[PDB]
Amino acid sequence: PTPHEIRNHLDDYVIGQEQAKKVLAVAVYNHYKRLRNGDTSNGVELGKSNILLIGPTGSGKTLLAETLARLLDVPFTMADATTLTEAGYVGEDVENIIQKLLQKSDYDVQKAQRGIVYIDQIDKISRKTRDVSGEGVQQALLKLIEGTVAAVPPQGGRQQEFLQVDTSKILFICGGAFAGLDKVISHRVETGSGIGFGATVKAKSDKASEGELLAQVEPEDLIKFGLIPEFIGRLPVVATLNELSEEALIQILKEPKNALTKQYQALFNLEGVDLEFRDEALDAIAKKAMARKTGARGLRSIVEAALLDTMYDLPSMEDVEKVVIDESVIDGQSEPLLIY
Amino acid sequence: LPTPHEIRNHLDDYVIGQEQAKKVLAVAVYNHYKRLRNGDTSNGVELGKSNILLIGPTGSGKTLLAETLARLLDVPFTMADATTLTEAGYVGEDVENIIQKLLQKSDYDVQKAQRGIVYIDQIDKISRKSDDVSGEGVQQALLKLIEGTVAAVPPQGGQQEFLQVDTSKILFICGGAFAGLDKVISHRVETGSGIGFGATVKAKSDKASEGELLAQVEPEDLIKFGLIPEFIGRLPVVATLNELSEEALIQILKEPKNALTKQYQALFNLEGVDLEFRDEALDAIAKKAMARKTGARGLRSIVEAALLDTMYDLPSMEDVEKVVIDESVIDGQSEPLLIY
Amino acid sequence: XXXXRXXX
Ligand SMILES: Nc1ncnc2c1ncn2[C@@H]1O[C@H](COP(=O)(O)OP(=O)(O)OP(O)(O)=S)[C@@H](O)[C@H]1O
Numbered sequence: 001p002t003p004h005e006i007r008n009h010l011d012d013y014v015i016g017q018e019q020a021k022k023v024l025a026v027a028v029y030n031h032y033k034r035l036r037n038g039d040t041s042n043g044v045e046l047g048k049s050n051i052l053l054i055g056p057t058g059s060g061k062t063l064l065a066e067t068l069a070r071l072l073d074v075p076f077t078m079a080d081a082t083t084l085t086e087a088g089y090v091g092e093d094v095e096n097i098i099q100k101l102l103q104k105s106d107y108d109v110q111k112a113q114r115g116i117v118y119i120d121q122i123d124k125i126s127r128k129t130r131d132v133s134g135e136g137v138q139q140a141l142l143k144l145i146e147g148t149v150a151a152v153p154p155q156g157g158r159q160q161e162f163l164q165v166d167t168s169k170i171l172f173i174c175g176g177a178f179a180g181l182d183k184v185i186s187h188r189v190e191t192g193s194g195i196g197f198g199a200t201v202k203a204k205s206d207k208a209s210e211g212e213l214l215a216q217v218e219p220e221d222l223i224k225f226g227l228i229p230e231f232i233g234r235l236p237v238v239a240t241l242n243e244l245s246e247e248a249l250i251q252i253l254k255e256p257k258n259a260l261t262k263q264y265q266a267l268f269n270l271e272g273v274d275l276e277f278r279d280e281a282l283d284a285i286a287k288k289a290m291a292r293k294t295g296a297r298g299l300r301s302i303v304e305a306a307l308l309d310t311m312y313d314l315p316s317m318e319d320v321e322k323v324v325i326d327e328s329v330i331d332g333q334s335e336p337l338l339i340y
Numbered sequence: 341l342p343t344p345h346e347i348r349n350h351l352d353d354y355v356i357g358q359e360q361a362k363k364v365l366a367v368a369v370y371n372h373y374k375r376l377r378n379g380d381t382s383n384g385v386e387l388g389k390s391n392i393l394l395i396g397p398t399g400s401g402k403t404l405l406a407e408t409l410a411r412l413l414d415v416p417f418t419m420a421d422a423t424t425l426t427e428a429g430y431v432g433e434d435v436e437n438i439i440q441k442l443l444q445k446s447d448y449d450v451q452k453a454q455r456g457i458v459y460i461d462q463i464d465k466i467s468r469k470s471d472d473v474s475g476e477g478v479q480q481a482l483l484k485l486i487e488g489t490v491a492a493v494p495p496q497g498g499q500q501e502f503l504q505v506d507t508s509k510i511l512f513i514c515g516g517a518f519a520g521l522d523k524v525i526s527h528r529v530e531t532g533s534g535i536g537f538g539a540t541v542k543a544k545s546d547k548a549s550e551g552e553l554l555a556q557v558e559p560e561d562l563i564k565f566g567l568i569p570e571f572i573g574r575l576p577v578v579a580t581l582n583e584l585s586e587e588a589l590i591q592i593l594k595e596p597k598n599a600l601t602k603q604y605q606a607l608f609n610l611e612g613v614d615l616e617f618r619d620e621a622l623d624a625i626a627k628k629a630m631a632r633k634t635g636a637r638g639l640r641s642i643v644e645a646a647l648l649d650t651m652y653d654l655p656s657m658e659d660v661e662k663v664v665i666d667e668s669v670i671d672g673q674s675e676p677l678l679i680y
Numbered sequence: 681x682x683x684x685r686x687x688x
């Protein structure tokens with residue numbers, strides 16, 4: 001484990017979040033640094049190092065977790081709380097997550113306790129006949145974080161034997177896009193606005209953007225959202241991710257093997273026709289993508305919206321060996337030029 | 341088994357700058373548990389309970405006193421917030437949820453949860469508005485709860501049955517901060533002033549401590565704040581934190597064994613590297629803490645943000661046995677010195 | 681199953 005090398009590999013699959021990568025390397029290294037030779041210190045109650053990710057949609061949270069699992073040697077799990085029903089109800093229960101962790105570790109208690117845990121869509125469990133997926137999920141999860149030994153039946157139960165696998169040694173990464181978490185932070189940071197000559201007047205949006213607003217967050221702000229303070233108390237670490245960058249959008253379509261440009265290229269290569277995308281068309285697409293405020297996930301809309309006519313007319317057309325996309329094509333005023 | 345002097349030292353180890361508060365909680369918790377051991381075997385029967393009501397500034401360690409107490413006492417503890425609470429049947433919340441929260445610590449308690457402790461935050465938010473589901477109405481529901489009663493509670497959520505648990509035995513600690521209470525008591529006891537020429541101005545915002553005035557607080561002043569006298573009668577014990585001090589913050593990082601300065605020191609001990617924290621660096625943290633009006637709660641943000649670069653590069657770096665931090669580094673204009 | 685929670 002090297003913070004300089006883990007950051008180099010994540011740079012290959014993730015772009016636009018440099019500060020967040022530094023935070024994960026420190027917290028991840030501190031997690032294992034304690035398990036192998038820790039808890040043999042002069043001072044008692046060494047704080048458990050955890051991670052709390054927070055970012056907008058399409059910010060690559062799932063990708064960061066995925067890239068870590070592949071790199072990392074121990075196993076990794078992706079356990080969302082969308083369907084986590086407490087008290088063993090019909091939907092699901094929190095105990096299954098412990099079970100799925102062992103499947104990845106192949107019933108290795110020594111190897112499973114050193115595992116990592118990640119959860120997505122944690123905003124949905126915010127407290128509001130009965131409530132099943134509400135505040136109840138916080139109570140079950142709270143025991144899992146603070147620290148406690150649970151009972152899981154090995155192989156599901158043939159005897160009534162359970163495995164008392166520790167949980168304080170396992171890491172947890174609670175992360176999910178918090179909707180509405182900007183208005184609450186705005187009230188504290190804004191602190192009103194002056195009316196006189198000397199006092200400065202804020203514009204439509206100068207510091208109210210998503211970027212540079214989450215870094216100054218505090219634990220008390222999350223309490224008003226609905227989360228429990230004890231749950232936030234166990235995660236002193238926080239990771240703020242920027243929405244996006246114009247330059248990163250150009251790189252995502254060229255360097256990654258799964259870029260959208262390469263996808264449509266093979267779609268036409270089978271038909272016996274070539275495809276091309278000039279650099280003047282890539283940067284133009286990035287300006288329209290950021291306006292949608294959806295991220296890389298909403299990037300395919302701009303592409304197919306432009307190549308609709310290009311793809312519909314194409315089959316009827318013959319002798320079109322290659323098609324070139326000019327910057328005007330993205331605007332939609334001028335149709336793409338055909339090469340015969 | 342413990343005594344007020346023994347618990348005072350343990351509390352002192354984790355809390356400082358609050359001497360009167362220690363004696364209040366010590367004798368209160370001491371006599372409270374004495375009643376449980378002896379029960380009602382003596383001539384006296386139905387020994388009344390003594391509740392506790394804390395009033396102090398924000399981030400003054402009110403929650404720490406209740407958390408550290410649960411560790412030494414070993415009894416279950418919960419941290420409930422009254423902001424969400426609503427008046428008997430509205431969208432926000434119902435009082436029933438609080439009862440299950442305490443049981444949730446062990447999830448199985450018949451003769452064990454009666455001896456537990458409960459904490460409440462932001463009690464002033466339910467002050468009786470005099471222009472209601474937020475105001476007075478909420479207080480009326482808690483009267484019977486504190487006085488002692490039994491509520492049906494499904495153990496673990498599930499039987500066709502519910503368990504009865506007494507609450508007279510259960511002690512309650514209503515924590516909170518009463519902002520603006522200085523003006524009410526000042527005109528009543530010390531002097532009517534602040535606006536006139538001869539009248540003393542509020543010059544000593546931070547030069548002098550408002551705490552001394554809070555020591556002369558009485559229940560009659562709380563009535564003007566908005567609380568019901570009947571509600572305050574159930575909480576005869578009163579605890580008053582005075583303030584937080586800049587020099588105390590330096591002691592908070594040195595005297596307590598669980599200080600944040602000591603955690604990083606122990607982190608590098610196993611690594612074979614020395615750590616240092618000069619006095620010239622801690623005083624700067626005090627100024628930044630008071631600047632954000634957050635107290636000790638907004639301390640990790642200043643420390644973790646400063647040591648992000650050093651911690652990330654410490655594993656990569658070799659032949660480094662000591663680290664020195666300076667006041668300039670806290671400001672961000674300098675980089676910490678490294679000794680090989 | 682279904683919760684009908686409304687407040688005036
Ligand atoms: N940092 C990134 N670098 C490169 N491509 C990215 C990045 N983030 C998102 N993408 C692209 O967008 C797709 C979806 O990304 P996701 O990480 O799933 O978005 P998301 O915000 O994590 O979804 P949610 O909000 O967690 S449901 C990926 O398959 C990539 O094609």
Ligand SMILES: Nc1ncnc2c1ncn2[C@@H]1O[C@H](COP(=O)(O)OP(=O)(O)O)[C@@H](O)[C@H]1O
Nearest residue numbers: 354355356398399400401402403404592636637
């Ligand atoms: N004497 C102290 N020593 C160490 N930490 C303290 C001390 N006093 C307060 N704190 C810090 O304050 C935080 C708790 O604040 P809290 O008491 O909940 O505020 P409030 O009084 O508004 O409820 C803890 O994270 C704790 O580290």
